Amino acid sequence: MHVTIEQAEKAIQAARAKAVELGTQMCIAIVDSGGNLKAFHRMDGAWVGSIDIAQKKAKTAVFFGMKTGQIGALSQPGGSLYGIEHSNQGLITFPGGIPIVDADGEMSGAIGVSGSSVENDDAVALAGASAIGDTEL
Amino acid sequence: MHVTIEQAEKAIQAARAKAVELGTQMCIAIVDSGGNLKAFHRMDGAWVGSIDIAQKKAKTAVFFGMKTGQIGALSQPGGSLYGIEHSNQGLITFPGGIPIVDADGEMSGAIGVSGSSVENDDAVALAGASAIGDTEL
Amino acid sequence: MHVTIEQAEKAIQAARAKAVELGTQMCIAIVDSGGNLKAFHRMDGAWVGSIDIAQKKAKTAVFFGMKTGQIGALSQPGGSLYGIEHSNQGLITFPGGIPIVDADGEMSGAIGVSGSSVENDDAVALAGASAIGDTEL
Amino acid sequence: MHVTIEQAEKAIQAARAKAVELGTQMCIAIVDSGGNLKAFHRMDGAWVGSIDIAQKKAKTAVFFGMKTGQIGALSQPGGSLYGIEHSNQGLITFPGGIPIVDADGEMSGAIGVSGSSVENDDAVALAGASAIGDTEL
Numbered sequence: 050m051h052v053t054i055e056q057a058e059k060a061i062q063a064a065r066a067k068a069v070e071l072g073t074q075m076c077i078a079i080v081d082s083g084g085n086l087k088a089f090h091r092m093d094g095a096w097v098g099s100i101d102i103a104q105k106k107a108k109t110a111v112f113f114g115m116k117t118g119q120i121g122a123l124s125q126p127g128g129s130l131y132g133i134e135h136s137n138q139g140l141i142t143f144p145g146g147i148p149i150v151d152a153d154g155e156m157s158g159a160i161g162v163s164g165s166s167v168e169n170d171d172a173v174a175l176a177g178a179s180a181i182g183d184t185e186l
Numbered sequence: 187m188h189v190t191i192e193q194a195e196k197a198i199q200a201a202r203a204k205a206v207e208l209g210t211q212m213c214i215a216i217v218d219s220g221g222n223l224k225a226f227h228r229m230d231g232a233w234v235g236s237i238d239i240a241q242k243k244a245k246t247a248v249f250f251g252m253k254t255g256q257i258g259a260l261s262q263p264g265g266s267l268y269g270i271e272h273s274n275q276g277l278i279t280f281p282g283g284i285p286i287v288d289a290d291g292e293m294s295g296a297i298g299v300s301g302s303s304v305e306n307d308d309a310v311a312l313a314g315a316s317a318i319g320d321t322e323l
Numbered sequence: 324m325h326v327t328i329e330q331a332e333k334a335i336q337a338a339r340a341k342a343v344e345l346g347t348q349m350c351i352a353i354v355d356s357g358g359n360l361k362a363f364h365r366m367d368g369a370w371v372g373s374i375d376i377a378q379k380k381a382k383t384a385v386f387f388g389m390k391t392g393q394i395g396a397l398s399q400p401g402g403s404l405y406g407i408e409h410s411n412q413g414l415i416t417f418p419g420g421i422p423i424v425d426a427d428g429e430m431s432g433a434i435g436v437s438g439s440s441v442e443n444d445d446a447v448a449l450a451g452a453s454a455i456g457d458t459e460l
Numbered sequence: 461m462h463v464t465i466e467q468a469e470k471a472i473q474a475a476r477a478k479a480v481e482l483g484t485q486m487c488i489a490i491v492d493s494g495g496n497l498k499a500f501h502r503m504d505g506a507w508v509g510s511i512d513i514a515q516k517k518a519k520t521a522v523f524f525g526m527k528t529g530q531i532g533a534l535s536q537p538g539g540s541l542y543g544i545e546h547s548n549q550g551l552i553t554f555p556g557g558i559p560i561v562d563a564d565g566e567m568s569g570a571i572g573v574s575g576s577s578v579e580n581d582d583a584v585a586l587a588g589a590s591a592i593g594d595t596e597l
Contacts, residue, residue: 098249101274112372129441135413137375139272167266235523238548276546304540386509403578409550411512
């Protein structure tokens with residue numbers, strides 16, 4: 050199953066509402082199971098650099114079926130995945146990207162959020178993915 | 187507001203005069219609030235590798251509303267932004283990029299400086315940005 | 324000697340057999356002595372990000388006549404090859420790439436595997452390369 | 461002054477001679493003061509990955525007027541130039557790139573060497589640069 054645009058826009062609205070609640074201005078990306086962009090929302094006032102980061106987080110999460118920070122935990126110096134960010138045109142491996150998981154437990158896409166602390170990025174990401182499905186495989 | 191070319195050239199000449207005072211030969215870039223190049227000055231004798239770095243520093247500063255070294259403080263191994271430099275076609279996160287801030291407190295662009303020690307890069311950047319506004323949000 | 328398509332496909336089959344035995348879904352790439360793609364197999368269910376990583380691993384191994392993790396042992400902070408991954412359009416230096424070495428001891432190509440833990444990647448890579456030659460120079 | 465093709469080839473021959481003395485197979489690159497390729501020699505049997513590295517080493521040296529490893533000493537985690545390798549389409553900051561310095565003390569280009577240990581890379585580069593000028597500014 051592929052994330053629909055209706056589902057993607059509902060995730061963005063849930064993410065946007067959390068971001069406001071937290072006092073943040075976020076870029077919010079949704080990609081499909083191939084990493085191809087499905088929807089994007091740049092909140093007024095969000096950092097211009099967060100545009101690319103939010104999309105790379107969404108792509109990273111769906112490319113590996115993991116939350117983005119779970120990869121960064123493995124890609125430190127001495128880590129088993131050291132250097133992995135060079136692949137796939139550039140990954141982002143700090144928090145803010147989460148898989149979208151359908152009721153079957155199949156990954157249908159991913160959300161990527163950037164614009165604030167990575168903790169706030171992850172909270173907004175989680176609200177968006179939680180609005181339309183599960184988040185863990 | 188957007189930085190004007192008159193402001194950009196005034197910032198460049200102030201940076202140039204500080205660089206001379208310090209015995210340095212610098213590349214000095216100004217970008218607008220979208221990261222697009224507004225003005226650039228390579229001093230005679232400046233390292234060729236500083237051309238790209240000065241421009242990437244200005245872009246990085248304006249993309250995140252921060253001095254570039256403030257991002258590098260967060261992107262070390264174990265840091266919350268570890269790996270961020272892979273985004274946005276390449277960031278520079280050591281000192282030398284500073285936001286240009288208007289009287290309304292709005293970021294209108296950014297300056298970037300490369301060609302010496304990062305401390306002199308930052309001193310020259312600051313002289314340039316202070317000639318045309320504030321530097322902090 | 325160059326790796327033939329018959330050898331490349333035999334290696335892929337031996338790698339796929341190992342992957343299934345270990346319970347994994349892998350991308351498997353074979354490149355020739357110039358780093359040019361010779362064969363590729365993405366098992367059903369394999370992570371999409373493993374497509375690029377498997378090819379970069381194979382390229383990395385043939386480009387230096389070493390298993391990929393042997394390079395990463397030398398490219399940690401403080402290591403003699405720190406930063407090598409920025410070369411050659413992006414290298415991968417954790418396990419999963421192995422040279423293919425013909426009976427004369429000449430390197431004819433390399434295999435690259437991605438999709439599970441790096442330990443399983445290397446076991447799958449080994450099974451495939453072992454099926455058509457030696458693995459050490 | 462610019463390095464001439466006569467100087468570049470004399471430097472290449474001196475490097476090849478030292479590489480043979482050491483039992484190594486090297487790629488040897490000469491770039492002009494702009495970083496543009498002037499001459500290149502891949503010894504028979506040199507690692508294919510050393511083609512790009514030798515050229516990036518020469519580019520890096522001329523771009524900053526330093527031996528490449530002097531930059532890597534500064535670009536470790538915690539270092540003032542951490543992440544500099546992302547600039548200028550990819551630098552190499554381990555040993556093997558050395559500036560070429562004419563009699564007037566002007567840098568006219570650079571040599572870059574890859575194919576063995578970084579220590580042999582640097583010894584071959586030095587042999588080649590020494591043949592046509594000084595190596596320090």
